[PDB]
Amino acid sequence: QVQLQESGGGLVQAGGSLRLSCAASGSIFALNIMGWYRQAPGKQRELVAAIHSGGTTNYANSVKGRFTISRDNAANTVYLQMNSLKPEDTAVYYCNVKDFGAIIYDYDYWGQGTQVTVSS
Amino acid sequence: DAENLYFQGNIFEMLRIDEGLRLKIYKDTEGYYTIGIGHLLTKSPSLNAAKSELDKAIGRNTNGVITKDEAEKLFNQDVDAAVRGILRNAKLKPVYDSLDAVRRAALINMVFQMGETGVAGFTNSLRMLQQKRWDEAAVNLAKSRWYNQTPNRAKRVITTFRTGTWDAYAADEVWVVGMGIVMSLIVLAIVFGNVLVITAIAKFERLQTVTNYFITSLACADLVMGLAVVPFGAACILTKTWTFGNFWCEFWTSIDVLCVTASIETLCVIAVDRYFAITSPFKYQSLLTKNKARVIILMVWIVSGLTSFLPIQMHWYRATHQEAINCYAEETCCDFFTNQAYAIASSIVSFYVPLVIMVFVYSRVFQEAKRQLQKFALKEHKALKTLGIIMGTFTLCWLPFFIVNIVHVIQDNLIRKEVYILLNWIGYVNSGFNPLIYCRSPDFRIAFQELLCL
Ligand SMILES: *SCCOc1ccc(CCNC[C@H](O)c2ccc(O)c(O)c2)cc1OC
Ligand code: NA
Ligand code: NA
């Protein structure tokens, strides 16, 4: 019963930079993976960027080198720097939290989602 | 008397409860050398003196170990000698005749234990049993040295003298079927339980992860356990004997050691899996693939097969002592006799090595969770209870057995066989608890619901 507050999504010109944000209000297990997923028009839900609770990160092959994920020090707020945006990056970006408190499996939390549009 | 129900009114079934069946020479509560069913060999403190008297009774070199046929033959000889001793005495017979069939047996019990002349020592008690003053004789007998040395058996015999029924021994039969219906449930829970798990991962595509590929292995070892090991194991305990032959004795034993080793070693793999899947999830997803994981599983079964079927089918696991040789020669005996080598070698591989890894791994999990990029939350308290159940259950089930299994061989048995088989079953039921521990995921939850349409 925790919450995820997304903010940042909007209209940008092709090549412009955009910053996303996701505040995790509630109590989450220490070991976790926060990140972002997107749904391109007519495409399945894809992993954009993800950062473990241990600092390490992970990106997709189509965004690695343009997108840079990072997180706050104690507020559990993950920021997603999005630079050199493409018209094919236009999608619905969801916030995501992988909890590990069950040890054997991983429970998922999600956000409301934000719309990001890139003018081709 | 047209009586073919299980329990009857006889001294034979009465003594078997008081005096257990032991094929090898042992010492009673007094300290005298005894074999079989309460058959006194000698009061001599020398074991070799007991062997000589034993071999003069059987008629062959027994090496302090007899068979079931020879044990029963001695038992009936002793009971007959007890009765013939009662009838040939001046104090016993006037009482014996004036007793009912049940109370007659109670008198034979004492004579079977402390000899003809000994029971005749009870001048007051016998007079009271002769005048049918049961309650007074019940109190008087509770003041004897026989009561102070064997209070458990005395209380049962005295009660039988008092009531005139078999109330003290008939309570044994309720537990016979009472534990049978429990075993009947254990088998069902394991079979139906693990089939459900395997069916879920095999059908649904969302449950096809590396961790679940290990779950499938665990569910496989536990399934065969509930189909091969557990049933055949219970089938003998209830029937007191093994009715399948020597070839299937070791084969069933081979399956046992195989599946149990594969089950515990898989628990170890899952533990390590969930460590890397949490600690270093990005490297875990790249390095460990389904092909690599299939190699890991293959390794586990090979190690399990190398420590089960390989030594057993080659008679390497076998012990050398006289009691072991007999059981290997007996078609109705399928006891688990091993040497110091195999007992330790198997325990380390089957249990201890996975135990060490599972503890060290889960410790690092609780360790590296305190050192992250982050105030008294309850999400960590609940997660702590989870691992306390995962590891606690596995411990509470198998640890009592493998500790005893290692003590069972380090010294000549001071640990009862009743305890040995019981603690194996406490480990057996772990194969039923597993799906209730390693399949609580929301995806498993939804899968289990649709697999039976609840
Ligand atoms: S009624 C006939 C005898 O019943 C009987 C005999 C022997 C056993 C032993 C069964 N367990 C073996 C044990 O699980 C085990 C597994 C793996 C290893 O490595 C080792 O060393 C032991 C059981 C029964 O009846 C249950
Ligand atoms: Na009969
Ligand atoms: Na045998």
Side-chain angles (χ1 to χ4, degrees), chain A residues 2-12 14-24 26-42 45-63 65-85 87-119, chain B residues 2-4 6-29 31-55 57-72 74-87 89-144 146-147 149-154 156-202 204 207-291 293-365 367-369 371-373 376-377 379-381 383-413 415-454:
Chain A
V2 309
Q3 308 299 330
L4 298 181
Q5 271 292 301
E6 307 188 20
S7 61
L11 292 84
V12 282
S17 297
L18 206 160
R19 183 186 308 272
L20 298 178
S21 175
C22 180
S27 64
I28 313 182
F29 183 69
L31 296 159
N32 64 86
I33 304 180
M34 303 183 65
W36 299 84
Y37 290 85
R38 71 179 180 179
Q39 286 204 217
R45 176 154 42 81
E46 189 186 6
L47 170 63
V48 179
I51 177 174
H52 184 243
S53 58
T56 41
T57 68
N58 189 31
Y59 314 94
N61 296 268
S62 58
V63 297
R66 303 186 299 108
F67 290 179
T68 297
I69 198 176
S70 58
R71 65 190 302 166
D72 199 88
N73 181 241
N76 284 129
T77 303
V78 167
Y79 309 92
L80 183 61
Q81 180 80 1
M82 303 189 305
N83 310 325
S84 181
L85 291 171
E88 52 225 28
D89 295 331
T90 297
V92 188
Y93 293 84
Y94 301 93
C95 177
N96 169 261
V97 171
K98 256 75 173 182
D99 192 305
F100 291 148
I103 302 183
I104 308 301
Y105 62 92
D106 49 332
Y107 179 81
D108 292 335
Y109 297 91
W110 297 86
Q112 310 294 146
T114 52
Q115 185 72 212
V116 172
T117 304
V118 175
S119 300
Chain B
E3 300 178 356
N4 276 262
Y6 185 80
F7 189 56
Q8 295 179 340
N10 55 15
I11 180 57
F12 305 100
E13 196 66 63
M14 179 183 181
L15 292 173
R16 179 168 283 99
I17 305 178
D18 293 328
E19 319 256 15
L21 177 62
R22 283 181 168 176
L23 306 181
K24 188 179 180 180
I25 304 185
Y26 64 96
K27 294 184 178 181
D28 50 25
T29 54
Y32 296 150
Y33 288 97
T34 310
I35 198 186
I37 314 180
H39 177 74
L40 180 56
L41 294 174
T42 181
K43 297 182 178 182
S44 178
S46 178
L47 175 57
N48 306 274
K51 296 176 179 298
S52 180
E53 294 295 330
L54 169 61
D55 297 330
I58 305 299
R60 68 172 181 87
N61 196 338
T62 61
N63 289 117
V65 167
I66 63 180
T67 61
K68 238 187 177 187
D69 198 316
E70 299 174 352
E72 301 297 334
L74 280 185
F75 177 62
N76 283 268
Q77 280 189 186
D78 290 326
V79 175
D80 288 22
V83 178
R84 292 186 302 104
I86 296 179
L87 305 180
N89 199 275
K91 287 181 173 295
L92 302 183
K93 192 175 178 301
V95 181
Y96 185 78
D97 296 326
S98 57
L99 287 178
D100 50 90
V102 184
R103 288 187 171 94
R104 273 189 179 184
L107 183 58
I108 302 175
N109 186 286
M110 303 179 60
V111 177
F112 181 88
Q113 186 175 23
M114 64 218 73
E116 168 189 358
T117 318
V119 180
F122 297 94
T123 299
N124 278 249
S125 298
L126 285 179
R127 187 194 69 260
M128 286 179 288
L129 295 175
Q130 188 169 341
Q131 302 173 13
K132 303 184 182 306
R133 307 189 289 185
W134 319 121
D135 289 272
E136 303 181 22
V139 171
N140 189 263
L141 281 171
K143 301 185 176 185
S144 63
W146 164 60
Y147 182 82
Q149 293 179 343
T150 60
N152 295 333
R153 179 175 178 174
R156 296 190 295 268
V157 173
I158 289 178
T159 302
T160 307
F161 266 138
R162 182 167 56 94
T163 73
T165 55
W166 299 92
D167 299 332
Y169 299 97
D172 179 38
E173 176 58 18
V174 182
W175 288 6
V176 171
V177 195
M179 70 179 179
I181 58 180
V182 175
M183 292 177 177
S184 304
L185 294 180
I186 296 177
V187 177
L188 296 176
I190 296 178
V191 175
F192 170 80
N194 290 279
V195 164
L196 188 68
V197 177
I198 299 177
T199 310
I201 309 179
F204 304 99
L207 284 176
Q208 296 200 356
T209 70
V210 177
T211 300
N212 289 13
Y213 265 94
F214 297 152
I215 301 298
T216 303
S217 177
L218 178 64
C220 280
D222 297 331
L223 173 57
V224 183
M225 265 264 305
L227 286 180
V229 188
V230 183
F232 282 71
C236 90
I237 300 178
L238 305 176
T239 59
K240 314 294 182 177
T241 44
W242 173 268
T243 57
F244 299 101
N246 291 345
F247 168 65
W248 293 101
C249 166
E250 294 182 328
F251 189 92
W252 163 77
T253 306
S254 299
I255 288 185
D256 193 338
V257 184
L258 175 62
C259 295
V260 170
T261 303
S263 179
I264 303 181
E265 288 181 2
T266 296
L267 291 174
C268 171
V269 171
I270 299 175
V272 174
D273 174 87
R274 296 309 300 174
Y275 174 78
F276 283 153
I278 292 178
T279 301
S280 176
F282 298 143
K283 288 168 53 186
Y284 164 79
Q285 193 171 190
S286 177
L287 299 178
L288 186 50
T289 64
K290 292 187 182 65
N291 293 272
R294 278 189 175 183
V295 174
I296 302 299
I297 294 301
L298 177 57
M299 285 185 176
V300 173
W301 287 89
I302 289 182
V303 175
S304 300
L306 258 50
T307 60
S308 59
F309 274 79
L310 177 63
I312 290 181
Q313 295 297 322
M314 293 291 297
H315 297 347
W316 295 346
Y317 84 109
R318 291 193 169 186
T320 64
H321 59 280
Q322 188 65 32
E323 191 176 0
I325 305 297
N326 293 15
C327 191
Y328 295 151
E330 181 64 28
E331 295 289 341
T332 67
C333 185
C334 188
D335 294 337
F336 189 69
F337 292 112
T338 55
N339 43 74
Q340 294 185 357
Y342 187 86
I344 299 179
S346 73
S347 296
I348 294 184
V349 180
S350 301
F351 179 73
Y352 292 106
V353 157
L355 176 63
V356 173
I357 301 178
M358 288 175 62
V359 166
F360 178 80
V361 162
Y362 286 154
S363 301
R364 283 287 300 268
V365 175
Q367 167 185 158
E368 205 165 348
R371 46 179 189 184
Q372 295 290 312
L373 302 184
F376 303 153
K379 194 60 171 297
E380 291 74 10
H381 304 163
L384 188 58
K385 183 184 63 180
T386 300
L387 53 88
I389 294 182
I390 300 174
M391 200 57 195
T393 300
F394 160 73
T395 294
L396 195 59
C397 287
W398 277 121
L399 182 67
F401 169 72
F402 286 103
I403 285 187
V404 165
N405 186 25
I406 229 60
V407 173
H408 181 272
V409 203
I410 193 181
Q411 189 183 358
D412 199 327
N413 295 143
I415 173 66
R416 299 150 52 185
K417 190 184 72 174
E418 315 287 306
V419 187
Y420 186 85
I421 309 180
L422 172 62
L423 292 180
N424 213 124
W425 272 79
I426 299 189
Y428 278 157
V429 305
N430 177 261
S431 291
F433 285 139
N434 289 336
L436 304 183
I437 298 184
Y438 301 90
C439 298
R440 300 192 56 178
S441 78
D443 285 87
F444 268 119
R445 288 273 193 173
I446 299 168
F448 292 156
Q449 179 182 183
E450 186 161 337
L451 277 187
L452 40 82
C453 291
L454 191 61

